[PDB]
């Protein structure tokens, strides 16, 4: 079981409407666990998972201070980038960052992340070697040469290999149980027809966590990849997810098709068919 | 640990 601790940060300039909007969201194994939002009179880092309420006021105070420090730095960065791209001060612009660490089941670093984007596009990223940067355009080359000269990469490598890992281990101790939770899908097949010689069988999976799941339809042995309609997995809004997969089949041949639901909360994959009770 | 103090772009 590998694990990760990552922070997703957003700064959006709002010329004429106030100060930039600033957001930090922290994730342990892709599960949101803290959040800072600048849109408040006294913005504070907040717990987003009940197992984080164990942390004392010192922790929260320090996180809040850092967030406020990052907010100011991003306010400067937004201005710098207007210059690099020679853009007007009247436009809204976005800087995004993904920063953090994933470690193996042994607790050691597998990957360090530090990726920046400007207006939804790659700007600059720390390579997997944790020593060099990839710049995506001419503007990012300025940042790159600056950071190389000042040896920023090695300072950042230290944080990622040390502090990041250490905090991840701490957060896992308090939240591991919660993070390992699984809700298995309840599945069923619905049947739809307009006045025509075909029908639609829709295989549904509901109330499941985590989001990762696979649905297939089988005719005979073979899976029907090309013919299926699929929707993206989506939140029910209560912490669980939904998905469905559907196939158009000949009228009267419903019982030749089988739906399969694969999910880690299932001891064995579910198999099911259209089943009219009357 | 967020953390703070990233270098300027």
């Amino acid at each position: 079981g590998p694990h990760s601790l990552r922070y997703f940060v957003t700064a959006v300039s709002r010329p004429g409407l106030g100060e930039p909007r600033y957001m930090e969201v922290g994730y342990v194994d892709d599960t949101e666990f803290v959040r800072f939002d600048s849109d408040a009179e006294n913005p504070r880092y907040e717990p987003r998972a009940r197992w984080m309420e164990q942390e004392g006021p010192e922790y929260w105070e320090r996180e809040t201070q850092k967030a406020k420090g990052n907010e100011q730095s991003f306010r400067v960065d937004l201005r710098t980038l207007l210059g690099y791209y020679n853009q007007s001060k009247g436009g809204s612009h976005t800087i995004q960052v993904i920063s953090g660490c994933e470690v193996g089941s042994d607790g050691r670093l597998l990957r360090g992340y530090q990726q920046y984007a400007y207006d939804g596009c790659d700007y600059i990223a720390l390579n997997e070697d944790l020593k060099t940067w990839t710049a995506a355009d001419m503007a990012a080359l300025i940042t790159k040469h600056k950071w190389e000269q000042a040896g920023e990469a090695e300072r950042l490598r230290a944080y990622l290999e040390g502090t990041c890992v250490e905090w991840l281990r701490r957060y896992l101790k308090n939240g591991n149980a919660t993070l390992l939770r699984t809700d298995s899908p309840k599945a069923h097949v619905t049947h739809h027809s307009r006045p025509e010689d075909k029908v639609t069988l829709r295989c549904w999976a509901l109330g499941f966590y985590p989001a990762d799941i696979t649905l297939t339809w089988q005719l005979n042995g073979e899976e029907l990849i090309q013919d299926m309609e699929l929707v993206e997995t989506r939140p029910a809004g209560d912490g669980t997810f939904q998905k469905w997969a559907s196939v158009v089949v000949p009228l009267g041949k419903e019982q030749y098709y089988t739906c399969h639901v694969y999910h880690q909360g299932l001891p064995e994959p579910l198999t099911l068919r259209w089943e009219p009770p009357p | 640990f967020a953390p703070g103090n990233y270098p300027a772009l």
């Binding site: 976005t94 939804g120 989506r234 029910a236 | -």
Partner: protein, 99 residues
């Protein structure tokens, strides 16, 4: 470099006429993050619509969930309307109780 929102409209629970439920409007894959989301009942704006906090995914694109309480009936039409700089006109997606 703008990205066009994708939209799904659907209920939290399987719909049953006269039984309270939640209607969701899930909007993903969009950039910039400023976006306007309305939920409509028979063409008329539903006033009490709550919004989750925003997030973004590994490809930088943003996503958010709008929702509202509702009690479905046989004949009521629902929809979700989204306005975003990536599109000339607002995009409207109708609720299909089979989807």
């Amino acid at each position: 470099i703008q990205k066009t929102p994708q939209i799904q409209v659907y209920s939290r629970h399987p719909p049953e006429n006269g039984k309270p439920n939640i209607l969701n409007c899930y909007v993903t894959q969009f950039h910039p993050p400023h976006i306007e989301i309305q939920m409509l009942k028979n063409g008329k704006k539903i006033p009490k619509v709550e919004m989750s906090d925003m997030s973004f995914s590994k490809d930088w694109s943003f996503y958010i969930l709008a929702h509202t309480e509702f009690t479905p009936t046989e004949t009521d039409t629902y929809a979700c309307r989204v306005k975003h700089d990536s599109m000339a006109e607002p995009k409207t997606v109708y609720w299909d109780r089979d989807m």
